Each structure stands twice: as C-alpha cells, then as structure tokens.
Amino acid sequence: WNRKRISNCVADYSVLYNLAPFFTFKCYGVSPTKLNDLCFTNVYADSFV
Amino acid sequence: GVGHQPYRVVVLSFELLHAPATVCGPKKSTNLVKNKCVNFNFNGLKGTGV
C-alpha cells in the first residue's frame, strides 16, 4: 500500500492530462477543469494494479 | 491507446427558435378544424383548445 505524499508542489495537471498511458480521469467532489485553480493542503496518491 | 486514438466527432447545433421552421421530422399534416375544442400540434407546439 504505497501512499505517495504530495506537498510543496506546483501541480500542473496539463502534463497529467496529456500523459500518454493514462486516459480516464473520474473525479468526485471537484471539477477537473477547476483542478488547476485550487489549493490543497496535502495530496495522497495510491498507485496499484 | 483508446484514449489517445483519434475519434471523429460530429457536432450538431440545433436552433430552437420561434421563427417559421424549415427542418422537421417525419410527420404528416392533417385537416384544419375550426370552432371546436380539439387537440393541436403546430410545428412541435402541442396544446388543446378552440
């Protein structure tokens, strides 16, 4: 259970949106087009298969 | 990949206006009945009246 902690970033989501392998971008609670306009205290990433 | 493969996209921009319409779906026109309480349908505008 690898929980990557994300803090002190400038999260540009355009690189993630234009990333070659990953396609689906489902979101709950926030709007994806607004995702470059907000500030989060901490982000946590879980990358599984 | 599937999200990076090209997709042909067709956008139809419909015009819903109170002007006399030129494009319509397949439907026939019946006789015009006056001075009686009937149901009517003028170019998609439905109603019931005299």
From Swiss-Prot, chain B:
| Origin: domain of life | Viruses
Give the region (Disordered) as residue ranges.
18-40
Please explain the role this protein plays, according to its UniProt record: Attaches the virion to the cell membrane by interacting with host receptor, initiating the infection. The major receptor is host ACE2. When S2/S2' has been cleaved, binding to the receptor triggers direct fusion at the cell membrane. When S2/S2' has not been cleaved, binding to the receptor results in internalization of the virus by endocytosis using host TFRC and GRM2 and leading to fusion of the virion membrane with the host endosomal membrane. Alternatively, may use NRP1/NRP2 and integrin as entry receptors.
Quaternary structure and partners = Binds to host ACE2. RBD also interacts with the N-linked glycan on 'Asn-90' of ACE2. Cleavage of S generates a polybasic C-terminal sequence on S1 that binds to host Neuropilin-1 (NRP1) and Neuropilin-2 (NRP2) receptors. Interacts with host integrin alpha-5/beta-1 (ITGA5:ITGB1) and with ACE2 in complex with integrin alpha-5/beta-1 (ITGA5:ITGB1). May interact via cytoplasmic c-terminus with M protein. May interact (via N-terminus) with host bilirubin and biliverdin, thereby preventing antibody binding to the SARS-CoV-2 spike NTD via an allosteric mechanism.
- UniProt protein name: Spike protein S1
Q: Which organism is it from?
A: Severe acute respiratory syndrome coronavirus 2
Intact protein stretch covered? 502 to 551 of 1273
